[PDB]
Amino acid sequence: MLDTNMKTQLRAYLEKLTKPVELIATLDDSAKSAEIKELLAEIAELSDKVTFKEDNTLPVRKPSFLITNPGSQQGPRFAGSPLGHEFTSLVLALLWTGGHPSKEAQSLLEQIRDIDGDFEFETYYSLSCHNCPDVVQALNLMAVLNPRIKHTAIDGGTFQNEITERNVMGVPAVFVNGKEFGQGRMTLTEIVAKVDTGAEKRAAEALNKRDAYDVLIVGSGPAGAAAAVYSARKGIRTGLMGERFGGQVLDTVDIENYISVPKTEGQKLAGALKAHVSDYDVDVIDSQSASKLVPAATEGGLHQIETASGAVLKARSIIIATGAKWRNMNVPGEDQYRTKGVTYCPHCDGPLFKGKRVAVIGGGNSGVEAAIDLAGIVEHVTLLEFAPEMKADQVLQDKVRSLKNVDIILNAQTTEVKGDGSKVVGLEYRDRVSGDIHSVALAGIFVQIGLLPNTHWLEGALERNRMGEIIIDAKCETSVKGVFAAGDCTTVPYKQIIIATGEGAKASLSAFDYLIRTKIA
Amino acid sequence: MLDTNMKTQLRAYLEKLTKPVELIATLDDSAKSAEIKELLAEIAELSDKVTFKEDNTLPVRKPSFLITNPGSQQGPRFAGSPLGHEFTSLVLALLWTGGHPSKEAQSLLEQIRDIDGDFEFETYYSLSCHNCPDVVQALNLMAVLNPRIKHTAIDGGTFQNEITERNVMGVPAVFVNGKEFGQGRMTLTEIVAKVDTGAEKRAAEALNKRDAYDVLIVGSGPAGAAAAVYSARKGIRTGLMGERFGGQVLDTVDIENYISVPKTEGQKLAGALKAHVSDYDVDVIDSQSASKLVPAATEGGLHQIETASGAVLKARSIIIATGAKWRNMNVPGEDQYRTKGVTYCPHCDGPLFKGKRVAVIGGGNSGVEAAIDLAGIVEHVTLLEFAPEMKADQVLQDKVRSLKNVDIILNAQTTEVKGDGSKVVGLEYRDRVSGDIHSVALAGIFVQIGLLPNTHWLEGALERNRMGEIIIDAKCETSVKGVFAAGDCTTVPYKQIIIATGEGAKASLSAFDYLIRTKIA
């Protein structure tokens, strides 16, 4: 059943709905059906914009419910329990249906809304499974975005019978129009690339007719832009493809460590990178997502990059510069206070809180070192570690535990970020041991949870470490000849703009060397 | 005896004398004395500003000659033959005496002119020795700069007797005021550091009383400036010492690959780096040369940096960022056409010569790849390799030998760069096999001979590769705990401004990590 903290979190999330949401259930006399009925009734009382209706006559699984807006039959459907690890999947399905935007690439969202064709997806999950959430969330978002795409996420614990009849060997297990589609972790980009394989739009057909490149750079944040300038300066045929030019820089509000520029803005630096790239002959391709790398069958041959849009670009050398997603706490309040107290930048804004109190989320070496540094300039620091013991090396723990102005909370998970509409003013978190919720007043929150390199699409194609970073050497060479990598998606120790531009340059020079050594004279 | 090409080169060099030079010989009846007499008479006929006088009554070795200006007794003295590998040492002694400036650090020159005290140096060399030239040249420059410093460079082939009486075991062998001073390769900085050890000036005594730093950065070109910004942003006590702020950037005229800046000037970028560093609390120390690194005796202890001026700075961590000297052809015309056709930049100015002819000096992988690239955009390329066979990998040779617009000259050494007062117009070089001199008309010369990392002062203290580059890993860690390195003085594969600033940042973050792990709480 929903426990007290899930109800508290859900209420906070739902205050944000801008459009009404209706939960339509189809139930039978089973015990599980009674749990679902009680669950939906409990969710509906948390918000004025959410209502519960039941129609036991519909030709759908029992129990199951549709998440939609009044007056429509559009939306994802959950068959069985949507709690456990799918709680966040349920929260997102409610918020997106209620008008909340997705954080996915805008070009990807647009391609999903334009998908032609009918696709009925079904995904089997288990409440304890850790990789099902991403898959369920990706397909639910597609169903919210395009009425021609249906999705029913099925709880394997409730429809145990189906899992044996259909040979499901592991979760998450996805079927589309009756046939196996995929198993295991999958990103929205990879799902879209696999399903929208028909006559591609104008953009795709055009890309398919481009001549092969001497170097194609994938991703256009600072590392890729830097590579593009260096390559074009050598006069070779250069392609730079990416989702949106500028990478993380574009949305950054204040930057004070891009060497030689005391202070600039994300939009202006991104614009300057664009102007530097436009000073040369570079084919800049925007609004495209690379979905697959197919290595050259021979030395001096061509590598291929497939895109989500269905096109295939080809080149003599490749530079991967897709960056990384920066992990969130995923709690109510976080998005709203995104530029008003919640800080994700790895090495900035500390002097901003001199004389104030802050928190650091994460107890690994970076988290503990971030606390030690902040302790030197802020009035106070609260550090929250999810595990029962800090993960940092011993020597760091010993030093952080000797600082009077720092408090270490173990076995804790943030449950909410509080504000007054203008700035952050506190956070609430939960003691994993006892379930109790505690509050703490503060002006800043430094999230230092981790990074998620945008490299899943390269799985099995280039060697990566356990965290997903592409392994490179000093020359930015990968495990595949002619393929290089630069920036935050690689094993480079620190993630900064000036570091990424320097890596992009190195990768471009290595690719140039590789080209002269292998290109036919 | 002087051969025809040495006479040709010397005549070209001496056209540049601005002040008259007098060669004063003291000779005996020996055969070697007759050679010296003929040599000096031959040099004096090559220039209106050079005269030969002999005074066999002076209390100096026979044969020997003083290189000075009329009316003075100041200058270096050569005892025996000044030819063979000392030819360039003789050329420099003539030019400096004739008013030509040294390319050494200005602060170093100033310290030499201010040396108090009398020092009579003697250096034994052999005509075939390869490391004697630098030592002889360093001491000769000191004697030209300060009358209280005398130097007599002695040809061991002529004074064979002395070499056995004084136990000389190898050359170069230096004595000062009668006592052994040093043996082996030595730089001017290291010689000055060892001889000027008295009551240091005001600057030094002041430096000695500075508190220990949390990080001291040695060298203030782009890598060191970047490190300084990153360190100060962490709020630690940061010192940045260097000879002259800006490093190679300061004298660069046009820069078009500093990412995000389509085009700027060396003076302006250097100024911007200075402004970024001044936005924080960094103790910037100029006009100082590090001469020795003394590693901390214990973890968490202090490393020491000794300076040529006699001071000792100390710090918990050190970042070495001293860059590299870029090798020259060392021929008449080169200096004068420094910014007018002769290009040393590793990856710039190629499109500048579209439709024109150029040369590339150097046949290693960089030289051959530079030729292949230029061949794509210039009308013609002549590549000169000193050795009898290109050193580049086979695959590169095969490709460069298939390009019709490129000519490869093996067994060659440039002897002169020609111009019309405004721009380069050609070069002459010599065929090592036959001695013949050839000319070639052209508008550009790309020198790609090699780099000389400014790391000799670190010999034996940090591990370096055969070329003198400090070995580092991805985190910029060296072979000594708490000492990091960044930029052109390290093993980083490519030497560029944007690459160096990114490395400086990495090194600063690694030093910060090291500091939190070892500094007492």
Ligand SMILES: Cc1cc2nc3c(=O)[nH]c(=O)nc-3n(C[C@H](O)[C@H](O)[C@H](O)COP(=O)(O)OP(=O)(O)OC[C@H]3O[C@@H](n4cnc5c(N)ncnc54)[C@H](O)[C@@H]3O)c2cc1C
């Ligand atoms: C909120 C915030 C503030 C920050 N502030 C600073 C700061 O002040 N100073 C600083 O130095 N650093 C800062 N950083 C870190 C800095 O932004 C990164 O280190 C830098 O942007 C990394 O550059 P990059 O080129 O490697 O990758 P990114 O900038 O991530 O760019 C990669 C690009 O590739 C795109 N892409 C991803 N996958 C694909 C695919 N499959 N196909 C095609 N394109 C794809 C991405 O969408 C993106 O546009 C900040 C980071 C954050 C999150």
Ligand SMILES: Cc1cc2nc3c(=O)[nH]c(=O)nc-3n(C[C@H](O)[C@H](O)[C@H](O)COP(=O)(O)OP(=O)(O)OC[C@H]3O[C@@H](n4cnc5c(N)ncnc54)[C@H](O)[C@@H]3O)c2cc1C
């Ligand atoms: C003529 C020319 C043009 C160039 N043009 C470009 C270009 O357009 N774009 C580009 O990207 N790159 C260019 N480069 C290369 C670029 O300048 C270098 O890669 C860059 O300056 C390296 O920075 P650095 O900080 O490592 O070292 P450097 O700039 O060399 O600076 C090291 C500093 O340390 C000082 N120092 C040395 N020894 C000591 C000591 N013992 N104690 C104290 N201080 C010391 C040096 O004198 C110097 O000031 C050019 C190079 C040359 C020679």
Ligand SMILES: [Cl-]
């Ligand atoms: Cl940052």
Ligand SMILES: [Cl-]
């Ligand atoms: Cl360059």
